[PDB]
Amino acid sequence: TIAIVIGTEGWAAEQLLKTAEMLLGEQENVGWIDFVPGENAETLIEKYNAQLAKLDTTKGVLFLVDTWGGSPFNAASRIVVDKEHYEVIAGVNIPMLVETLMARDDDPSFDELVALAVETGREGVKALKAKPV
């Protein structure tokens, strides 16, 4: 399947994956990294590369990161730059992770998966508000 790597400031990436697996069961072909104060983008590039070495990246790689412009995002950006089937998507949330992991098994094309991740991530943000009676 298409490889997924999750990166956030701190230690949240591992937990977002754990949460997803609590919902979907253990996942294959997924990696994650942490970012600790004192580290820079170059440290992170190495961390991402070490994770990729263990993943099947033949169909592509989708980096799901916490926020646009942070170190995790900047480092991932440097890796995907002139690579086909490599993308970085900021704002990772559980709806995005769950929908993306579910679709991945039905072997979608890379563009299809990227589009689904952005759409489900955004549609997943919703307020309860008053309900009709």
Partner: protein
Amino acid sequence: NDYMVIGLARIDDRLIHGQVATRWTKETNVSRIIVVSDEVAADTVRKTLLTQVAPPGVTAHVVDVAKMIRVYNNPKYAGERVMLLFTNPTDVERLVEGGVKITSVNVGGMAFRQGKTQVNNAVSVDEKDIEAFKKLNARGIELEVRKVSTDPKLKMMDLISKIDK
């Protein structure tokens, strides 16, 4: 048998929870979902919310056990594949007694509670739930326990056999 076709029977006191209904809907190829519960049917507020969050392309219906037996007695859904959602195995034995045909029952999840015994990570059974499962098994009906189709399938009798003799 020449009437509606039960694509799958999932038991869950939460009905739709997480992507369990979304993933199970696509894998089970289900375009219709019917909820059988008198307590929920009496909650107009909950019915509205469940109907407004019904997955796209999928219709969610809310009916009572007595009304459900009649909907199945109508060939209007013949061949149609529908998923049955229950909150307790007691309501499943009732449909069978009405002449409903069930080949197997899948346990999705059951809120734990005091006085009950935990058989799985989130599945609890009381002397009443166990008694219903034994009757279904005595009828040759298969009972499988699993939270997601990607998780290993376990036999309800095996889990209750290592607890209740």
